[PDB]
RNA sequence: GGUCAAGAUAGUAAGGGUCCACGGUGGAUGCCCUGGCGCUGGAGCCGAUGAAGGACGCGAUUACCUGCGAAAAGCCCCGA
């Protein structure tokens, strides 16, 4: 979610993390669309959570690369 | 008391005037500060790593502002 247990992963295992999220997202966009949002922080949360990702490939590219 | 005569004089206000009472309209005066001005001192360049400044977006709901930038009213580390 946030510490050492999101690092583990490899190259295809970080870009496949993203796309699952995205696809949830959208799902929640179209149930947004025809008013089936119960839960509106789940959203937020999948936004949050693929920035980390986003944040972390970009930390390891240079803890590595340097 | 009655009739006639000769006199003289009052009230009525359609509307108006002055004063009084009570309102309405309007936003002066007073009180206040959420905002300004001056002087004294501090500080003093930003930009091809893409500035100043903008466009379009990012909200469960978002028209304006603010804050961001497709990782979007936020993501990571250190400190309080």
Redesign the pocket.
């Known amino acids: 979610m946030?510490?050492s247990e999101m690092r583990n992963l490899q190259a295809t295992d970080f870009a496949k993390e993203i796309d699952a999220r995205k696809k949830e997202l959208m799902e929640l966009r179209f149930q947004?669309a025809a008013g089936q949002?119960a839960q509106?922080h789940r959203?937020?949360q999948l936004?949050?959570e693929?920035?980390?990702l986003?944040?972390v490939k970009?930390?390891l590219a240079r803890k590595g690369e340097q």
Do not use: G
């Open positions: 946030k510490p947004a949002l509106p959203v937020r936004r949050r693929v920035a980390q986003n944040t970009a930390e």
